[PDB]
Design a protein around this motif. Structure first.
Motif, PDB file in Angstrom:
ATOM      1  N   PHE A 178     -28.275  -1.037 -27.622  1.00  0.00           N
ATOM      2  CA  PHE A 178     -27.019  -1.639 -27.134  1.00  0.00           C
ATOM      3  C   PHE A 178     -26.081  -1.915 -28.310  1.00  0.00           C
ATOM      4  O   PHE A 178     -24.888  -1.542 -28.242  1.00  0.00           O
ATOM      5  CB  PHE A 178     -27.328  -2.856 -26.263  1.00  0.00           C
ATOM      6  N   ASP A 179     -26.601  -2.501 -29.385  1.00  0.00           N
ATOM      7  CA  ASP A 179     -25.771  -2.794 -30.582  1.00  0.00           C
ATOM      8  C   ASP A 179     -25.190  -1.499 -31.186  1.00  0.00           C
ATOM      9  O   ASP A 179     -23.987  -1.467 -31.580  1.00  0.00           O
ATOM     10  CB  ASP A 179     -26.620  -3.560 -31.579  1.00  0.00           C
ATOM     11  N   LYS A 180     -25.988  -0.436 -31.291  1.00  0.00           N
ATOM     12  CA  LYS A 180     -25.439   0.857 -31.799  1.00  0.00           C
ATOM     13  C   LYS A 180     -24.288   1.360 -30.911  1.00  0.00           C
ATOM     14  O   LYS A 180     -23.227   1.866 -31.433  1.00  0.00           O
ATOM     15  CB  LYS A 180     -26.561   1.885 -31.926  1.00  0.00           C
ATOM     16  N   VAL A 181     -24.481   1.292 -29.597  1.00  0.00           N
ATOM     17  CA  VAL A 181     -23.455   1.797 -28.645  1.00  0.00           C
ATOM     18  C   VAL A 181     -22.184   0.950 -28.811  1.00  0.00           C
ATOM     19  O   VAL A 181     -21.091   1.500 -28.873  1.00  0.00           O
ATOM     20  CB  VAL A 181     -23.961   1.815 -27.186  1.00  0.00           C
ATOM     21  N   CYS A 182     -22.341  -0.356 -28.831  1.00  0.00           N
ATOM     22  CA  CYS A 182     -21.167  -1.272 -28.874  1.00  0.00           C
ATOM     23  C   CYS A 182     -20.461  -1.078 -30.228  1.00  0.00           C
ATOM     24  O   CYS A 182     -19.223  -1.096 -30.276  1.00  0.00           O
ATOM     25  CB  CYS A 182     -21.567  -2.711 -28.653  1.00  0.00           C
ATOM     26  N   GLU A 183     -21.196  -0.838 -31.321  1.00  0.00           N
ATOM     27  CA  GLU A 183     -20.515  -0.593 -32.610  1.00  0.00           C
ATOM     28  C   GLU A 183     -19.740   0.734 -32.507  1.00  0.00           C
ATOM     29  O   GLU A 183     -18.611   0.779 -32.932  1.00  0.00           O
ATOM     30  CB  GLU A 183     -21.532  -0.575 -33.742  1.00  0.00           C
ATOM     31  N   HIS A 184     -20.309   1.766 -31.897  1.00  0.00           N
ATOM     32  CA  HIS A 184     -19.600   3.057 -31.725  1.00  0.00           C
ATOM     33  C   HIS A 184     -18.301   2.861 -30.917  1.00  0.00           C
ATOM     34  O   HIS A 184     -17.274   3.538 -31.203  1.00  0.00           O
ATOM     35  CB  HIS A 184     -20.511   4.026 -30.994  1.00  0.00           C
ATOM     36  N   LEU A 185     -18.351   1.948 -29.941  1.00  0.00           N
ATOM     37  CA  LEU A 185     -17.214   1.655 -29.046  1.00  0.00           C
ATOM     38  C   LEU A 185     -16.236   0.671 -29.698  1.00  0.00           C
ATOM     39  O   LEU A 185     -15.243   0.359 -29.028  1.00  0.00           O
ATOM     40  CB  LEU A 185     -17.769   1.106 -27.734  1.00  0.00           C
ATOM     41  N   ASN A 186     -16.534   0.084 -30.853  1.00  0.00           N
ATOM     42  CA  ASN A 186     -15.637  -0.951 -31.454  1.00  0.00           C
ATOM     43  C   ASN A 186     -15.508  -2.148 -30.511  1.00  0.00           C
ATOM     44  O   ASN A 186     -14.407  -2.671 -30.408  1.00  0.00           O
ATOM     45  CB  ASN A 186     -14.260  -0.372 -31.761  1.00  0.00           C
ATOM     46  N   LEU A 187     -16.600  -2.519 -29.817  1.00  0.00           N
ATOM     47  CA  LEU A 187     -16.595  -3.555 -28.772  1.00  0.00           C
ATOM     48  C   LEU A 187     -17.267  -4.797 -29.322  1.00  0.00           C
ATOM     49  O   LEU A 187     -18.457  -4.687 -29.722  1.00  0.00           O
ATOM     50  CB  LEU A 187     -17.352  -3.030 -27.558  1.00  0.00           C
ATOM     51  N   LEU A 188     -16.524  -5.912 -29.336  1.00  0.00           N
ATOM     52  CA  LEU A 188     -17.053  -7.224 -29.767  1.00  0.00           C
ATOM     53  C   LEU A 188     -17.436  -8.128 -28.583  1.00  0.00           C
ATOM     54  O   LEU A 188     -18.383  -8.899 -28.748  1.00  0.00           O
ATOM     55  CB  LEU A 188     -16.011  -7.893 -30.654  1.00  0.00           C
ATOM     56  N   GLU A 189     -16.733  -8.072 -27.456  1.00  0.00           N
ATOM     57  CA  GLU A 189     -16.998  -8.946 -26.268  1.00  0.00           C
ATOM     58  C   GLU A 189     -18.105  -8.280 -25.443  1.00  0.00           C
ATOM     59  O   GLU A 189     -17.849  -7.765 -24.347  1.00  0.00           O
ATOM     60  CB  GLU A 189     -15.715  -9.182 -25.478  1.00  0.00           C
ATOM     61  N   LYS A 190     -19.307  -8.245 -26.000  1.00  0.00           N
ATOM     62  CA  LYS A 190     -20.421  -7.402 -25.532  1.00  0.00           C
ATOM     63  C   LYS A 190     -21.081  -8.021 -24.307  1.00  0.00           C
ATOM     64  O   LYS A 190     -21.784  -7.265 -23.596  1.00  0.00           O
ATOM     65  CB  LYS A 190     -21.432  -7.230 -26.668  1.00  0.00           C
TER      66      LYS A 190
END
Length: 284
Positions: A30-42
């Motif tokens: 999940f953390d890898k995907v959210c970093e790829h997406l530039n997403l902080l409000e996970k």
């Protein structure tokens, strides 16, 4: 360290490929995907996978991925898990952008029903965000958008999207995304996770889980509502799911409503979704 290849379907329909260690918990992927997406409000998002019965499951971030996917492929989708009742209160425009992509898919899939006019209006805001201002160079009398708006399309629908697009001149993508969400959040099925069950009388119903509580639908029709504050306790056992409802002010005892689910896994899944939604929306 043994690398497992992971494939994650992103909300724009593209496929993200990465490796995680074989013993990894869901949080790592999940953390890898959210970093790829530039997403902080996970916290509104998660990953789903399909089990051997072809049922959608949320990947538990606290548990080993291998103990979840078991015999299956390490293939996931990135999805909204908790639909915010007030998307204007999200901190970041990029969080609203991903929510819009999810809702687009909810509409095109038919999971989120929508009137003709609202389909057109939502579509018009999508076109304004993706293309900018109405461009008659690109749009003749025979125009059909490359954008999918609805489960199926008519020329009348495409024409209405155009008519409404014309009205949005000067609107920025973030503005069009906010308008999209202010309309989408009013749809009756917005954020409602549906589960097939039978009532205690063996009648087939749908149970909906969402921010405001539990919904019981009798035949594609809203009937009964239990707001989270009215729900004392929920449990499962075998393929049964139980809702305990707080007594009215001067009533002595809680009431119990029982449902039969297709199997034990379905009863467990429903209980988990309910506990997660109750917790998230009590605290949000």
């Amino acid at each position: 360290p043994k690398s497992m290849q992971c494939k994650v379907i992103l909300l724009d329909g593209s496929e993200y490929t990465c490796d995680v260690e074989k013993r990894s918990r869901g949080q790592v992927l999940f953390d890898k995907v959210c970093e790829h997406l530039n997403l902080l409000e996970k916290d509104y998002f998660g990953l789903t996978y399909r089990d051997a019965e072809n049922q959608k499951n949320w990947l538990d971030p606290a548990k080993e991925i291998k103990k979840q996917v078991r015999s299956g492929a390490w293939h996931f989708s990135f999805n909204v898990k908790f639909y915010p009742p007030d998307p204007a209160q999200l901190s970041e425009d990029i969080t609203r952008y991903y929510l819009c992509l999810q809702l687009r898919d909810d509409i095109v899939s038919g999971r989120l029903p929508c009137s003709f006019v609202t389909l057109a209006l939502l579509g018009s805001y999508t076109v304004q965000s993706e293309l900018g201002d109405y461009d008659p160079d690109e749009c003749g009398s025979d125009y059909i958008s490359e954008f999918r708006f609805a489960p199926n399309h008519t020329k009348e629908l495409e024409d209405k999207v155009i008519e409404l697009h014309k009205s949005h001149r000067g609107m920025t993508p973030a503005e069009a995304e906010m308008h999209f969400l202010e309309n989408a959040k009013k749809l009756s099925m917005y954020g409602v996770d549906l589960h097939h069950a039978k009532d205690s009388e063996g009648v087939e119903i749908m149970l909906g889980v969402c921010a405001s509580g539990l919904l019981i639908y009798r035949d594609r029709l809203r009937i009964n509502r239990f707001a989270w504050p009215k729900v004392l306790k929920i449990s499962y056992k075998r393929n049964n799911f139980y809702i305990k409802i707080r007594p009215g002010e001067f009533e002595q005892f809680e009431s119990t409503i029982g449902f039969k689910l297709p199997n034990h896994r379905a009863a467990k899944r429903l209980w988990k979704v309910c506990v997660e939604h109750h917790t998230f929306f009590r605290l949000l």
